Amino acid sequence: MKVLEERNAFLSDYEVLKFLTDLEKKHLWDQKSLAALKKSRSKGKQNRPYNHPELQGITRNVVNYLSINKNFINEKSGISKMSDESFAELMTKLNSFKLFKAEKLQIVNQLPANMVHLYSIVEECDARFDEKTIEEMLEIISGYA
Amino acid sequence: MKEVVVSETPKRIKGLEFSALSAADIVAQSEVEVSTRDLFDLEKDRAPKANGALDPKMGVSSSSLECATCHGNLASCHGHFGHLKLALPVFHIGYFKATIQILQGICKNCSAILLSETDKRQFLHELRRPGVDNLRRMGILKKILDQCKKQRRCLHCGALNGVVKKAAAGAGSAALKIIHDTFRWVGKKSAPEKDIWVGEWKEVLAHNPELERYVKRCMDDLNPLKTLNLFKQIKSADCELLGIDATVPSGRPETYIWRYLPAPPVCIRPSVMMQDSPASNEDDLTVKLTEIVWTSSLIKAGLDKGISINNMMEHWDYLQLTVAMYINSDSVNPAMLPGSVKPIRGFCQRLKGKQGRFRGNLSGKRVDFSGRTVISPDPNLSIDEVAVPDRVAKVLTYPEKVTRYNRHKLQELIVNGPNVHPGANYLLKRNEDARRNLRYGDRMKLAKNLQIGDVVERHLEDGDVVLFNRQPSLHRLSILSHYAKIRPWRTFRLNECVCTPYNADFDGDEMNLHVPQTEEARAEAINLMGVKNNLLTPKSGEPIIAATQDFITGSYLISHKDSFYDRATLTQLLSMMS
Amino acid sequence: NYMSNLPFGLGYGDVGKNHITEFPSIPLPINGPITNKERSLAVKYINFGKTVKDGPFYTGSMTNDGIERYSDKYLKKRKIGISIDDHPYNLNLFPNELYNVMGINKKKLLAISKFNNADDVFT
Amino acid sequence: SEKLVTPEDVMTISSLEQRTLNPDLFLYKELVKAHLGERAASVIGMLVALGRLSVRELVEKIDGMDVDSVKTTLVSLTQLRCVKYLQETAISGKKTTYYYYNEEGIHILLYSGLIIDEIITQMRVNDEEEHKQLVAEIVQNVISLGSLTVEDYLSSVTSDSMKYTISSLFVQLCEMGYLIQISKLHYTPIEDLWQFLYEKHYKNIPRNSPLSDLKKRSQAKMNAKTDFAKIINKPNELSQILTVDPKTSLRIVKPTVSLTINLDRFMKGRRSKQLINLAKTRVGSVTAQVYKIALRLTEQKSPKIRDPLTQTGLLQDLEEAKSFQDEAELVEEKTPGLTFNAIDLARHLPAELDLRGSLLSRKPHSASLINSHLKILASSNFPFLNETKPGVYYVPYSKLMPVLKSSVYEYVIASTLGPSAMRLSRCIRDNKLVSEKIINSTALMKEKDIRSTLASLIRYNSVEIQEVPRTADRSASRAVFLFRCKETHSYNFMRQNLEWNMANLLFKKEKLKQENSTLLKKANRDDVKGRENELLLPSELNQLKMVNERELNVFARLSRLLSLWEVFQM
Amino acid sequence: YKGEVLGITRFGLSKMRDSVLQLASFEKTTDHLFDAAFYMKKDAVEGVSECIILGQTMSIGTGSFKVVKGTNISEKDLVPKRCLFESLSNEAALK
Amino acid sequence: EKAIPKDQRATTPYMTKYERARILGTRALQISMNAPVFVDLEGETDPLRIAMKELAEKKIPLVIRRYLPDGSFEDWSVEELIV
Amino acid sequence: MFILSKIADLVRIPPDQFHRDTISAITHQLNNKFANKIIPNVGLCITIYDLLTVEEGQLKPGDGSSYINVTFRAVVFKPFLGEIVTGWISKCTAEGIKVSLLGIFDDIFIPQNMLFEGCYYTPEESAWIWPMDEETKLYFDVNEKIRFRIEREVFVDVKPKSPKERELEERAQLEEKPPAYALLGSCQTDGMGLVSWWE
Amino acid sequence: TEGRSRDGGLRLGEMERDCVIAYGASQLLLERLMISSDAFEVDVCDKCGLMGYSGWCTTCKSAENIIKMTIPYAAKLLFQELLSMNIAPRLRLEDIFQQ
RNA sequence: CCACAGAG
Ligand SMILES: [Mg+2]
Ligand SMILES: [Zn+2]
Ligand SMILES: [Zn+2]
Ligand SMILES: [Zn+2]
């Protein structure tokens, strides 16, 4: 074992969510597959899936944490309710705006619905922005695209 | 979550780096300091005394004790080292010649090398050539010592340097004394050292004028303490010319003089369990260790209490002799000790000879899965086959791993058991670690629950590869590899055509049978040492496996000119050969 | 046996301990209390060591996040001071093979560390 | 102790690991590691362990460092005069550079605070605080930068009066002999310099010359000795301040020369202080002050601590050894500066001394009283002074310094092992080869006390056992053991022991400063300093107090060790 | 081999071969081992006696090569999966 | 790295006896560790004879690295060696 | 929140897995090694994203398993210094508040030093209360969503002790260590509180 | 052990080892002289080259550089005997797979 | 632990 580099790139939560759900689909681990084969009826095809308990725990936990909504309301994340073209649209929208890579990552990872959340993510917003930019942040993020 | 990633990379030994243990390396690897001469305490009915030569913290010598360092038993403990601090340093018998040589190269007054600067640079340049071998290095070191001996006066101090040598070169304690004759190469030049020497000797004969006859025999003695203190103030840059690498912290010459004696683990010096009595006898190394501890304690007591210098030097010499005999037994006469005749067994005795570690347990050793039996002929056996008794095949087992191809066969073998011939003696489950004997179990539920990873030790069957050997091994064809057959007559049987490479005659010859226990070894044996692949001796390429006597004669009689056969006899002959 | 013979001054009970301590017991007469003159000496030694440590001749080595944000801006700079090549070496005191590593044509400067006669040590 | 001590405990708290190191390598590596970086420490360690080494050899032996790191480390060491270099040309034509190690720069690092204090004290600036501060600053900068040019130092001064005072102080320091022009001579080994000069003056003799080979070598070595003596005293020529007349009747140091600290003059001062300390315990209390004035008057003209010719490996001939002894005896006597009368001490004598009632013959800076003081200094058992002619006195260093070494070593032995060990050592020294019974008779104490104390004394090369065997097979049962005392063995062992103790003290100091890195780093900050009470938790402040107190005790004990150790370096 | 007729004996093997363990195992165990310890001579485990003593495979015979199992991975199966964020990330609003 | 390309090979294309022994040993060990076989066994229950049958029509997937004595190996597929 | 780490490694494929696809076998072995485990000085691994380079399988003499040097990119959970993330409050003490990420990573501990001024601990309800002027209703209740900013992540090695000391500790425990990867959150400005506070 | 009275085993002497060398069967020799007779798993420290117990180096007082290997027990006996003789065989290790 | 006695 030898870590060539600590960081090779960045991954948005859409990337990890899509990769993990593709892993569930390929390994037959989703709630649909288990509720169709192991539950709700007896197995006749005997379609045993890939077996890895630690990977079960970690992937199930991560997909549950990314599926649930974030700290913006007191029902789902919205990342699970948006596609690749919506992500492309969102980054084409966000590229022209005065944001850094880390800030764009954080706002696409969390998708704020609250004004105070947006001022929490970006640093010294009043020293860079004016009120119309914050407003337009709110409708571009609220559209989930 | 809470555990870190554990990684393991397989590794092999790239090479050894021999050195000498320093004092810090001896103490750091130690576990307990030996500070008594008593092995046992009588209030616990002969238990190992704490801080003794026998000690739990070193290890265990019996199956019922605990190590108290790894808390293992006899069969799972590697043993641990103790250390013992001698009251006064003594010479190492192994490094004694090296000590004399390194004393021949340094100044006996200021502890500096006896070489001019340009010659030192030239010799250092000649040592560091990028293709220096052991022979060239030894030659250059010998030339360096010759040049050092040829020096007369030190280049850093006006001190006359004589010749350094042994005392008497006998079997006694004089073998471990070093003398330095200062005024050997003095001539008549009247060095100031000669003036000082004659002044001191006139002064000492002013009081005792009977030592004049002993003046000529007095040279500068080099006791181990003076030698240690002289080595300690040597220059580090001078160590390379003496053949020692000083980059490592243990590269000083001071490491080659006994200051700390490492007490060996009791695993390598096991006390004898019983000898026709409950009492336990001790190995000679442990007795010598107790003697060394007693002598060191006695020397320390004499030093800090105040005893005549004759007795102190006598006990110093006795300690040196005891350590030397503890290392090498035949280096000194045992009668020179006050205690003593059977010579003791030292480490050098344990490492040398036909029964030493190198030629008795490392180059070759006794092996498992082997059998020795008288041989008898069998012409109806193929040349690549040897017949094994079933009474041997029931004992010698081959460990076969269960696969998808032989599951039914191994299940049947397990069902058969260890009494009938085609069967098994032991079964080892995949997840378990200790083999379960295939004699006390049900032998049926074990067969039904035979996993695909278990290892079953089946009986030696037909078609199995066995090494077959005759003990005088002159050439490589003395050991061959045959296919096993099973026959019930208590003797190994091999075809007579294979008799010639073995040089075996059926007149009471006992031959050996080895069974390899791994697939790689079995394949290599059958495809390199097989009888078919070794019909030719490599000495000249001629056949050596061929028709021996009584096969040549019958073949000649059949092929005689005046022998004729009709259809019946010819057909019978053809039927007998196939 | 081998235990039988003992010298004149020793007894049968004194032997056998073999206890040699690894710690010394004889101190040199140099461990006395501090006085004011050696106090000033220690101050001067500490000042010299501190002066050499941060100087242009030090090779002690035998943050650092690739991501950039606005809080990373308006931060204290690196504040580099007196590198190896800045010192004006006399070219005649060095071998020719050492010229290339040091700056021979680079703009050069020399730093001076002020000396404090007062005790900079708390105690 | 009351409980057994496991080897883990021995290797943890006791300094058993440090006892296996060569004291020279240990001290030099620890000094370089404490003052310079760790790469310089590794370079110095390899140079000490393997002698001279090329840059390629240094790269190959030291893993983890490339050619660039080795070269910049060598530059850093060369600037502070801690590495000597030499260029060698092969027979074929290859050029190589071999880097040595020299005790000069390492001792300069070792004696740093001592050197600064000696400069402050010895130029009578004990009453001018501004000049004292400037002298301390310039000397500290000289030692820190190794060798520096005056004009580039003056470029860091922005006041004209300060520039004038600094120039005057530089001229004063050069006049007193504490700063010399650094050259390639300071960077070449003495052995190789003598080899080069000897070969040059030997090959200059034409071949087939009509004289014997021994005569050829003798004449060549006389010529080489003369040339080497001319080469060595080049920094003492005092041509560094010859540049005069910038203004009307002003002498200044040359602007473009490179000045460096002179170690030999400082060690001469340390020899003077050691001699004064020796004289303080034999004769008088104001007699010691008169001796101090006499030594400080002729300190600069005194012969050097180490005759460098002796380090050329020329002592292999007994004739050369006795010639060195005779020349050393002659130079300390016939040098015009060294001789003095009673009158010459009256000028420099401080006004605080009285000398009126100091001496009672029966039962205002007067010259006769000074003469009597010089006479009683000369008429002591220890040869502090001698009279070439009546009214003329000079310091006989050659006959005085072995006495100083003997006294210091004997008192070290006394203060370590009781006065009985000193008495036995002196008794053995007086009767050069003495038996045990003669010691018993001639030293009045019990025989077991003698046996115990000499058994203690053997461990330190103080006394040597000479075995006289009365039989062919040598054995202690049939032999007689006599005792002798060799000065050189004991002196070398004591020097090595003190060197190891110094290195161990430095190692303990470095470990203490390393394990408290965070608090010490917070303490020695520009904002935090001065406001330590305000900005620190009370336990943290107390920990700072103990750490600093321990460090100060370490440096005090190191200074005392240096005072005890420099006697054996002479 | 070595330029001179060295012969086959304990005095000839000590000159032909520099391996510590083989010379120790042949003759003069104690002297050779102690000399090797004193001179600090490194021994490379490349011979046959060394490999037998230390229990690892030798470099002659069947050990004179390394057996390698091929793998059926082509380079076109190892194209890295796209990093969507890094592909879509671009800076125009800052510098 | 140090691999000789597939055309500059300057070692004999024949398969020596030691290579045969090592290949059969490794293949038999792999089979005994329950590896699949590419030949139709006819009831043979010994890994070594199955490995021999695999060699008889060149179905072993192993390759041989012939290390030249200077630090430059040389790949040879078992199916390519002649024997 | 998630990064790609490029790691070179040595994997061992047992001979029984030659029927599986070799990419799948390498992935399975790397998942056995790395899934849900702490890579020191890197973070917490989750899955192997893909493989970049593979070399020929080398065989050790004495074993039939195939060893492959493989370089792979793997997803790693490692919040950089500055990222703000949400979580679920698990436990409270007198030194800070503990928050988990619903089983992904429960070792997040917001200390006393970087909390709001005037925070105090109620032990009978075991909650943390902080007003600003008069709103004492602010409770750091258990099992409620919180937001926090990462301020300091710490790596510590296990450093196992002596076997005799390990045996003594085992005997004294059968008659405990800091997590190798930890992050310290903080709540300093607005929006760093609970979920039901700003809307 | 030795002798059939004590149920001993046959000895593969020096010349049998020589013949097995002459055939070149490396794996068979390794099996006969190491695996089937006196194989022993030991832990050796990479930093100092000495031997430890239960994954712990008794000199370095650490377990970050412990590698578990297998050697003949006679080799371990020889190494401990030499270490008692003030000879230090320090084993230097390298990876089987160079990549 | 040695020494006999046989077998190649
Ligand atoms: Mg016969
Ligand atoms: Zn144990
Ligand atoms: Zn000398
Ligand atoms: Zn270690």
Pair G128, G91: CB distance under 8 Å: no
The DSSP symbol for F65 reads E
Q: What is the token pair recorded at B523?
A: 């394949």
| Chain G: residue whose CA lies nearest to E67 | G59
- Closest by Cβ to H99, choosing from G55, G62, G159: G55
Tell me the residue length of chain C.
Answer: 123
Pair D265, D177: CB distance under 8 Å: yes
d(CA D78, CA B228): 36
DSSP assignments along B209-233, one per residue: TT-GGGSTT--EE--HHHHHHHHHT
| Chain H: residue whose CA lies nearest to F1 | H99
Nucleotide nearest to B345 (CA to C1'): I1
The DSSP symbol for B176 reads G
d(CA C73, CA D152): 38
Q: Is residue G105 located within the same domain as residue G70? A: no
Q: How far apart are the first and last CA of chain G?
A: 24
Q: In sequence order, what E strands does B9-102 have?
A: 11-17, 30-33, 40-41, 47-48, 81-91
Phi and psi at G167, nearest 5°, equal -65, -40
Pairing of strands F62-65, B365-366: unpaired
Helix axes D190-203, D213-232, angle to 10 degrees: 130
Tell me the residue length of chain F.
Answer: 83
Q: What is the token pair recorded at G47?
A: 């899955």
**Domain holding G107: CATH number?**
2.40.50.140
SS3 D162: helix
Q: Is the dihedral of CA D92, D93, D99, D100 positive or negative?
A: positive
Q: What is the token pair recorded at B490?
A: 């208590």
Tell me the residue length of chain B.
Answer: 578
Q: Is residue B24 located within the same domain as residue B80? A: yes
Query: What is the distance in A from the centroid of ligand 2 to the CA of B261?
Result: 20
Torsion of CA A57, A60, A62, A66, to 10 degrees: -160
What Cα–Cα distance (Å) separates residue D563 from each residue in D34, D273, D567? 21, 10, 7
HEC assignment per residue over D373-392:
HHHHHHCCCCCCCECCCCCC
Pair D516, D550: CB distance under 8 Å: no
Q: Is residue G120 located within the same domain as residue G190? A: yes
How many angstroms separate the CA of residue A108 from the nearest CA in chain C? Answer: 16
H-type alpha helices, D146-254:
150-154, 160-176, 190-203, 213-232
Rg over CA atoms, chain C: 30
Which of G94, G108, G96, G97 has the alpha carbon at shortest distance from G1? G108
Phi and psi at D286, nearest 5°, equal -90, -20
Q: What is the token pair recorded at B443?
A: 């032998």
Query: What is the distance in A from the centroid of ligand 2 to the CA of B94?
Result: 29
What Cα–Cα distance (Å) separates residue D70 from each residue in B374, C59, C62, D75, G67? 73, 11, 12, 9, 39
For residue G113, give the amino acid letter: N
Pairing of strands B424-428, B436-437: antiparallel
Whether B43 sits with its Cβ under 7 A from any strand I atom: the answer reads no
Pair D259, D150: CB distance under 8 Å: yes
d(CA B348, CA B335): 19
CA B490 to C1' I8, whole Å:
19
In this structure, the number of other CB atoms found within 10 A of the CB of residue D402 comes to 12
Q: Is residue G40 located within the same domain as residue G99? A: no
In this structure, the number of other CB atoms found within 10 A of the CB of residue D26 comes to 23
Give the containing element (helix H, strand E) for D433: strand D433-434
Q: Which residues contact H59 (CB under 8 A, 6 or more apart)?
A: B25, B28, B29, H45, H48, H50
Chain breaks in chain C (C to N over 2.5 A) after: 62
Bases of chain I with protein Cβ within 7 A: 1-2, 7-8
Which of E59, B361, B226 has the alpha carbon at shortest distance from F18? E59
Burial call B237-253: b when 16+ CB within 10 Å, e when fewer: bbbbbbbbbbeebbbbb
Q: Which residues contact D2 (CB under 8 A, 6 or more apart)?
A: none
Among residues G43, G77, G111, which one ends one of the domains? G77
Q: Is residue G20 located within the same domain as residue G56? A: yes
Q: What is the token pair recorded at A10?
A: 């960045």
Using CB atoms within 10 A of its CB, is residue C19 exposed (0-12), middle (13-18) or buried (19+)?
middle
Rg over CA atoms, chain A: 19
The DSSP symbol for B361 reads I
Pair D178, D119: CB distance under 8 Å: yes
Q: How far apart are the first and last CA of chain A?
A: 40
CA B333 to C1' I7, whole Å:
39
HEC assignment per residue over D287-349:
HHHHHHHHHHHCCCCCCCCCCHHHHHCHHHCHHHHHHHHHHHHHHHHHCCCCCECCCHHHHHC
Whether B507 sits with its Cβ under 7 A from any strand I atom: the answer reads yes
Q: Which domain holds residue G47?
A: 2-77
Among residues G47, G77, G107, which one ends one of the domains? G77
SS3 G53: strand
Q: What is the token pair recorded at A94?
A: 């966000």
In this structure, the number of other CB atoms found within 10 A of the CB of residue D77 comes to 25
d(CA B428, CA B436): 6
d(CA E7, CA B332): 33
Kindly state whether E30 is in contact with chain G, defined as any CB-CB distance less than 8 angstroms.
no
Q: Is residue B435 located within the same domain as residue B376? A: no
Kindly state whether F33 is in contact with chain G, defined as any CB-CB distance less than 8 angstroms.
yes
Q: Is residue B183 located within the same domain as residue B128? A: yes
In this structure, the number of other CB atoms found within 10 A of the CB of residue B507 comes to 7
In this structure, the number of other CB atoms found within 10 A of the CB of residue H46 comes to 16
Q: Is the dihedral of CA D112, D115, D119, D121 positive or negative?
A: positive
Which of D188, D179, D92 has the alpha carbon at shortest distance from D139? D179
Pairing of strands B365-366, B163-166: unpaired
Query: What is the distance in A from the centroid of ligand 1 to the CA of B480?
Result: 19
Q: Is residue B237 located within the same domain as residue B285? A: no
d(CA G49, CA C54): 46
d(CA E80, CA C14): 80
In this structure, the number of other CB atoms found within 10 A of the CB of residue G142 comes to 15
Subunit contact H26:E55, Cβ cutoff 8 A:
no
Q: What is the token pair recorded at C33?
A: 């209390």
Q: Is residue G73 located within the same domain as residue G120? A: no
Torsion of CA B502, B506, B511, B513, to 10 degrees: 90
H-type alpha helices, D62-211:
67-79, 103-110, 112-122, 129-145, 150-154, 160-176, 190-203
Pair D304, D398: CB distance under 8 Å: no
d(CA F82, CA B497): 32
Pair F64, G58: CB distance under 8 Å: no
Q: Is residue G188 located within the same domain as residue G121? A: yes
Pair B40, B46: CB distance under 8 Å: yes
What Cα–Cα distance (Å) separates residue B153 from each residue in D320, D563, G69, H86? 12, 32, 64, 35
Q: Which residues contact D248 (CB under 8 A, 6 or more apart)?
A: none
d(CA D102, CA D187): 9
What Cα–Cα distance (Å) separates residue H33 from each residue in B75, B214, F25, F29? 20, 61, 18, 20
Q: Is residue B30 located within the same domain as residue B138? A: no
Pair D116, D139: CB distance under 8 Å: yes
Q: In sequence order, what E strands does B380-524 have?
A: 385-389, 397-401, 424-428, 436-437, 455-459, 465-469, 479-487, 492-494, 510-514
Query: What is the distance in A from the centroid of ligand 2 to the CA of B293?
Result: 23
Annotated binding residues of H for Zn(2+) = 45, 48, 57, 60
Name residue B457's beta-bridge partners: B399, B426
The rounded Cα B423 to chain-centroid distance in angstroms is 40
**Domain holding G60: CATH number?**
3.30.1490.120
Whether B276 sits with its Cβ under 7 A from any strand I atom: the answer reads no
For residue D232, give the amino acid letter: I
Q: Is residue B104 located within the same domain as residue B7? A: no
B140: left (phi over 0), alpha (psi -120 to 50) or beta: alpha
HEC assignment per residue over A78-134:
CHHHCCHHHHHHHHHHHHCCCCCHHHHHHHHHHCCCCHHHHHHHCCCCCCCCCHHHH
Which of D85, F72, E60, D281 has the alpha carbon at shortest distance from C92? D85
Subunit contact G3:A8, Cβ cutoff 8 A:
yes
d(CA B54, CA B48): 6
Tell me the residue length of chain E.
Answer: 95
Q: Is residue B502 located within the same domain as residue B366? A: yes
User: Do G and C touch, counting CB pairs below 8 Å (3 needed)?
Assistant: yes
d(CA B84, CA B315): 17
Q: Which ligand is closest to the CA of B73, given by its number?
A: 2
Pairing of strands B30-33, B81-91: parallel
d(CA D120, CA D142): 14
Q: Is residue B390 located within the same domain as residue B531? A: yes
Q: What is the token pair recorded at F22?
A: 């090592």
The rounded Cα D273 to chain-centroid distance in angstroms is 12
d(CA B508, CA B506): 6
Q: Which CATH class is domain F1-83?
A: alpha beta
Q: Which residues contact B90 (CB under 8 A, 6 or more apart)?
A: B224, B257, B258, B316, B319, B320, B323
The rounded Cα C51 to chain-centroid distance in angstroms is 11
Among residues G53, G77, G101, which one ends one of the domains? G77
Q: Is residue G67 located within the same domain as residue G137? A: no
The DSSP symbol for H62 reads B
Q: Which residues contact D33 (CB under 8 A, 6 or more apart)?
A: D40, D41, D510
d(CA D517, CA D520): 5
- From chain A, pick out residues whose CB is under 8 angstroms from the CB of E83: 9-11, 15
Q: What is the token pair recorded at E34?
A: 């102690």
What Cα–Cα distance (Å) separates residue H72 from each residue in E24, E46, H15, H99? 18, 18, 19, 28
Q: What is the token pair recorded at F11?
A: 């070692």
Whether B361 sits with its Cβ under 7 A from any strand I atom: the answer reads no
Torsion of CA D253, D254, D256, D260, to 10 degrees: -50
Pair G58, G66: CB distance under 8 Å: yes
Q: What is the token pair recorded at H12?
A: 């593969």
Q: Is residue B228 located within the same domain as residue B212? A: yes
d(CA C91, CA D407): 47
The DSSP symbol for H4 reads G
SS3 D511: helix
Pair E53, E21: CB distance under 8 Å: yes
Pair H63, H56: CB distance under 8 Å: yes
- Closest by Cβ to A16, choosing from G2, G80, G196: G2
Pair B24, D19: CB distance under 8 Å: yes
The rounded Cα D323 to chain-centroid distance in angstroms is 25
Q: Which residues contact D446 (CB under 8 A, 6 or more apart)?
A: none
- Entry resolution (Å): 3.4
Pair A58, G46: CB distance under 8 Å: yes
Q: Is residue B364 located within the same domain as residue B493? A: yes
Pair D140, D116: CB distance under 8 Å: yes
In this structure, the number of other CB atoms found within 10 A of the CB of residue D509 comes to 20
d(CA H1, CA F17): 36
Q: Is residue B366 located within the same domain as residue B467? A: yes
SS3 B88: strand
Which of D212, D236, D232 has the alpha carbon at shortest distance from D224? D232
Tally of structural domains, chain G: 2
Q: Is residue G87 located within the same domain as residue G183? A: yes
Pair E69, G57: CB distance under 8 Å: yes
Pairing of strands B370-377, B492-494: parallel
Pair C83, C55: CB distance under 8 Å: no
Pair E94, H57: CB distance under 8 Å: no
- From chain C, pick out residues whose CB is under 8 angstroms from the CB of A7: 66
The residue written with tokens 């580090």 in the block is B236
Identify the contact set of chain E against chain H, taking CB-CB distances under 8 A: 33-34, 36-37, 48, 52-58, 60-63
The rounded Cα D569 to chain-centroid distance in angstroms is 6
Pair B80, B265: CB distance under 8 Å: yes
Kindly state whether F32 is in contact with chain B, defined as any CB-CB distance less than 8 angstroms.
yes
Helix-, strand-, coil-residue percentages of chain E, each rounded to 5: 45, 5, 50
Burial call B360-394: b when 16+ CB within 10 Å, e when fewer: bbbbbbbbebbbbbebebbeebebbbbbbbbebbb
Q: Which domain holds residue B51?
A: 2-92+243-354
Phi and psi at G6, nearest 5°, equal -95, 115
Q: Is residue B473 located within the same domain as residue B438? A: no
SS3 G99: strand
Name residue G68's beta-bridge partners: G11
In this structure, the number of other CB atoms found within 10 A of the CB of residue B77 comes to 22
The DSSP symbol for D164 reads H
Burial call D313-328: b when 16+ CB within 10 Å, e when fewer: bbbbebebbeebeeeb
Subunit contact C70:A102, Cβ cutoff 8 A:
no
Pairing of strands G57-59, G66-77: antiparallel
Q: In sequence order, what E strands does B451-571 have?
A: 455-459, 465-469, 479-487, 492-494, 510-514
What Cα–Cα distance (Å) separates residue E23 from each residue in E30, H10, H15, H85? 10, 27, 17, 18
